[model samples]
Target: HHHHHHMVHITLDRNTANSWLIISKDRRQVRMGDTHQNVSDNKERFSNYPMVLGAQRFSSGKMYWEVDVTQKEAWDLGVCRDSVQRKGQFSLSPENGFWTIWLWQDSYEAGTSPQTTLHIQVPPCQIGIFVDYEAGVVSFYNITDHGSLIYTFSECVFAGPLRPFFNVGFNYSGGNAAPLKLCPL
Candidate 1:
């Protein structure tokens, strides 16, 4: 079965910087089988959600996914389950600027738990996500950030029954949220 949903919100402005949106079913609906976009017109959403990647939904099974953004710098915040109400946020490109993954567990309560958070830095790059619902392992790759060979683990995919939400976005300090695409693996 395939479906689609649309969300139109205020464009990210300078004040929007550092403002992060928690990706979940309550926050958005899945549409187009595996493609979605969160955009802004006034302020660059990047300034606010610099991490860019938010969340996405997939079939209740294991699947591999990949995305390519040849336009600007992008990042993958993380892939999480909708049933878990956990505050999971991570900061990338903070220390050595080589793209770091940070996780904050049990920080906020939003009706979702057992959630996972992942962060990565990329400049006009592509990202791939691998989810093992049975094993509860989630991994990320920089198809362009690091030649697409270097892979990193954000969290395990054990938060079954495998209802995952994936998101991808550019990391720009300017605050202009652009269009995005997600392809199921």
Candidate 2:
């Protein structure tokens, strides 16, 4: 079945960013900071989660965005409910209000209830995210491979507004230095 895709523009929200994350001046690109910076503590800041939220939130409708992960050793991208915990350590699972996909150790995985292991022969250089709120579906696409299917989270009941989420991996030295750039359509 063919689905109409809607392009959505998103930028990293510095207030919700982690101290170890360096966001570009335009907020369109984010990379792991070489060293943590001195930043004021805020409840919205992801103290434990090494991730950042988009500046905008989506209530209902089709939303899509893309991330350039070329040469990145590890990264995660997806959507999370605005109410998701940002202060403490939490699983990137749907039960905890996060639906995401990650690449680590040269393998791809989806953050679902059971946590699916994706068998992608070619690592996606660019990833596309599509969300159909009314349909309760969130899908990831491998834009590097002509938009091949990566994973899909179906029947995701959104308790509140959903926001684009991103993480540039956790390892401080192991190939996490590359930036994950937000691509414009």
Candidate 3:
């Protein structure tokens, strides 16, 4: 298959960020806040989701981006439908409108109904996300290792625009303190 890798610039949508999440001024980076801030509640704000979406959305074609998750103990990164629930506790799975891969306590896995475990010999400092909406594929790569394939979700049917999603985990005590930055191409 001919691969068309289109570099996409994605910025964190501060309006969609959780109260405990810290978004940079430029919106290109996000980190778990050590202290919670008093922010007004809104429908788009995630109460317990602990995640944020990209400022841009995509419906078709291939796109690629990378995130820096080094020094983080736990994190989740991927793409989600614009309609994904943001108010309540929900599973981070394709069935629940999320196609993601997560890293926690030295373990890596794909966000599926059963949660597929990934065997990554080395922990990746940076993760690359590649999406082919027309082909129904979402793939993750270990960017620290020359873009090694980490995982892939196939046959994904996007009912709406898909946006980049990220979660540094709910540990507000500095455990997942590392900032998740959208690397500039």
Candidate 4:
């Protein structure tokens, strides 16, 4: 069996990221920043969390993007609503306009109102996220594990555009400093 689709090159939008997130010059990578970088205060900027959105937006279509979590210990990856909350106690849930999954150290789960724990045979160094806006489906694939299906969020309601989401988890006292890259495929 074979299935393939053109990789959607997602550029990290600096304007939509928190000041503490250090975006690469190419705007294709991000990591948990230690010191705050100089950035203008904007309504689109994420103030409450260290998260960022892709410059591109999807209204309707099947879009696919991959994140190179190669060396990252803990991170969050998935699709997010363009109109989702940008500030104040934001939670990544479908009700909150986020369809995503995350890696908490060795534990894995979907970011649903009630977290759905995922058991993977292998941790994906690189993960793939596919979204069918028309179908209202967002699925995560474990690339390192034969690109197996990890978890999926269906029946997603998006009245507007959506953006790719990334959060390289928290960087403790010098641990988990690995940066996340949007794979150029």
* Candidate 3 local lDDT, 78-158, one digit each (tens): 999999999978889988889999987779999989999998887899888889999999999887877778898999988
TM-score of predicted structure 2: 0.94
In model 4, what is the error at residue 83, expressed in angstroms?
Answer: 0.8
lDDT of 1: 0.34
Q: Give all TM-scores, in the order shown.
A: 0.40, 0.94, 0.94, 0.94
After superposition on all CA atoms, what RMSD does each candidate show versus the true structure? 12.5, 1.5, 1.8, 1.4
lDDT of each: 0.34, 0.87, 0.87, 0.84
- Which stretches of model 2 miss by more than 4 angstroms? 1-5
lDDT score at residue 137, model 1, on the 0-100 scale: 48
Look at candidate 1 and tell me the lDDT of residue 173. 41
Query: Residue-wise lDDT of candidate 4 within 1-185, one digit each (tens)?
Result: 02247468789999888988999999988988787887778999888778889899999888888889886668888988888888898677888988888888688989999889998988789888988889998888888888899987888887789988888777874667889898877
lDDT of 1 by residue, 10-129 (tens): 111122222343232333211111222443433423342333323344434455544444342333333443333322344332121112222222121111233334343443244555
Model 4: CA > 4 A from native? 1-3
Clashes per candidate (backbone, < 3 Å): 24, 0, 0, 0
Candidate 3 segments exceeding 4 Å error? 1-5
Better of 1 and 4 by lDDT: 4
Per-residue lDDT, model 4, residue 48, is 73
